[model samples]
Target: ALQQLFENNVRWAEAIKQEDPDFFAKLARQQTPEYLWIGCSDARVPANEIVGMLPGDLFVHRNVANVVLHTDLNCLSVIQFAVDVLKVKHILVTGHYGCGGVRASLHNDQLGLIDGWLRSIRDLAYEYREHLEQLPTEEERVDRLCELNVIQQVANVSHTSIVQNAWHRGQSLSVHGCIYGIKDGLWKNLNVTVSGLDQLPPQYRLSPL
Candidate 1:
């Protein structure tokens, strides 16, 4: 499977080479994409292709469950570069329906290595158990938890010092949450929007939290 993927990448490279002789050269120079995508590592969700974007179109950070942990310096560094260096206007946290990682956390089974990654989702479930259990079925609980996770991650991004500091210094950065449906290839907005520093909580608004 990996070899086949590598062959396909080569084919794509050759096709791009036909159009722009310096395609690789130009890409090697720099990237100034205006969007930051926080998405899952799901094979079905390709950030650029799903949005019909070309190379260097988006700055992305993908994780097993697409989480934004406070201690996750990996995603934080990407956020810093995208906002501070690349100056991306929008930061999006996208979760997908039928996410395997999320589904795994809803049950009693163990996923071994991936269990640690899914533990965050389990934490979210525990945090909102009352609301989640009010739902009709096991599937509904998982679906709601996935959406809630996106909401929390958006809040987490807004709480970042880098993002808030940018706001204080007069940069207009927006953070939003979204859920993707693999069945229909569509994105549904969560109706949760945080545009300015004022939208953040008092604890997050402080210069150094």
Candidate 2:
């Protein structure tokens, strides 16, 4: 453990305690967060801090470009836990403009292990090449892709069995596709919110059992 981190933790805890005297005790006892935040692993996009949320307010899962896949067990498991166990009401699939992962996905450069993780975004880029190529500048293409990635990931999350099952049971859950601007530190909704099974494409809808 770093001495600096320990010192920092003390100050952080002290500040929180000053605001709410029983904060830590209540936090340690129960975790009943209402929102699940799925976003990039970018250092600047600290999930809770970006939304002005406290520790128990949001459960988070992060990955490169915030890609969501049926095959990604870790991400899927987080959704299952948040939905089934925690009963979270909202899931936010967030991406940031100027995302390095999204930027790198535009190129053919090879990084070792993360290549496999970024494969989904790279395929998405190729699929939308016509649209992406229409953009005059590479930066605009990247920014557009970042926005597109969030909306796509929102669909991916909505497509999951956990969420579909939640909807099947008439759970009041809403999945949102949103983006964050690192420069401005503000979040923008892409208006791709799915509140129920009817909101998804017919093909993506499951038979409510």
Candidate 3:
């Protein structure tokens, strides 16, 4: 099985070279991606292919449910590198419909260490309990929660000190919320875009811009 995976890699690399002889050579030199994609870790949601982007076109960071927590240093480090170093103009926080993590959070499933991580989603579900309860079916509730999670993660990213510092220095960056459908294979923007301190809440906005 491992050999098959290696074999697949060889074929894929050959296909790339066949299409563009210098594709890998150029990619090896440097990476200057304009967008930072923060998305779910679902196998079906391949960040580059979903966006129709090449290898060096999009910088990506993925986690369960596409969460952006203040305490998550790994995700924060990627954001800092993407914004401060890579100077990516757009930070897209993307989630998807029918997410297993969202469903787990909805049911308060006990999944060890991951349960703690999914607690963020659980808190969100509890916050919108009344709205979710009114939904007719479990699927509707899970899907709505999935979308809501992306919106919250977008806000979380905008609130980060890294983004705040970037904004104060007049960096050209925008944080956005998006959701993809597993069945339809389409991305839907939630229209929750934060471009500058002015776009954020007064309490969340940083000073000295």
Candidate 4:
């Protein structure tokens, strides 16, 4: 798949060459990817290829389960840059069903080293257990938890000082929760979209207290 993707990229370069010989040269000057994509680092899921976009189409970060943990500095830095420096208009968190990371968290067995990463998802599962356990089946519970995890991560992004600071200075940025279907290869909008100053949570707002 990687080879095929690169071969297709070569064909794309050749096609662009038919239009302008200096297109790549011009593209080198400025990179203006409008969207920030936070997705799982699963081998089957390659962001640019799946989206049918080129290198400069998105500013992205990937982790085991596309999670945005509050303590994850590496992911946080990418988010800060995309939202603040690059001023990306949209941030999309695309988590897929049947994720290996999510599956690992679902099981009680301890994965030697990756437990820390998977534990965050497990923590979310436990934190929201009452709501999740009330669901009918194990499958339903897993599915619901995945959606809830994405929603909380979206909230995590909003809760960051970078986003709130941008809001304070009057930046027009929006955050969205998205799910990618592994079976159908389609991106579904979850309708948890938030934009402007009004929709932000009070936790993100400043106070004298």
Task: List the global CA lDDT of all models.
Answer: 0.87, 0.91, 0.93, 0.82
lDDT agreement of model 2 with the native: 0.91
TM-score of each: 0.91, 0.96, 0.97, 0.86
Better of 1 and 2 by lDDT: 2
lDDT of 4 by residue, 137-165 (tens): 87777777778778878888877777777
Q: Specify the highest-TM-score model's number.
A: 3
User: Per-residue alpha-carbon lDDT of model 3 for 19-119, expressed as tens digits?
Assistant: 99998998899979999999999998889988899788899999999999999999999999999999999999999999999999999458888998889
Residue-by-residue lDDT tens digits, candidate 1, 1-209 = 59999999999999999988798898889877879999999999889988888888889999987888878899999999998989999998999888888889888898799898678889888888889889998878878888988898899998888898888878888998999888899988997878887787786686733
| lDDT for position 205 in model 1 | 80
Q: Which residue window of length 10 is worst by lDDT in model 2? A: 200-209
Candidate 2: tens digits of C-alpha lDDT, residues 65-91:
898889889999999999999999999
Give candidate 4's error at residue 190 in angstroms.
0.9
- Pitting candidate 1 against candidate 4, the one with the higher lDDT is 1
Sorted by lDDT (best first), the order is 3, 2, 1, 4
- The TM-score, computed over Cα atoms with residue i paired to residue i, of candidate 2 is 0.96
Candidates sorted on TM-score, descending = 3, 2, 1, 4
Which candidate, 2 or 3, has the higher TM-score? 3
Q: Which stretches of candidate 3 lie over 4 Å from their true place?
A: none
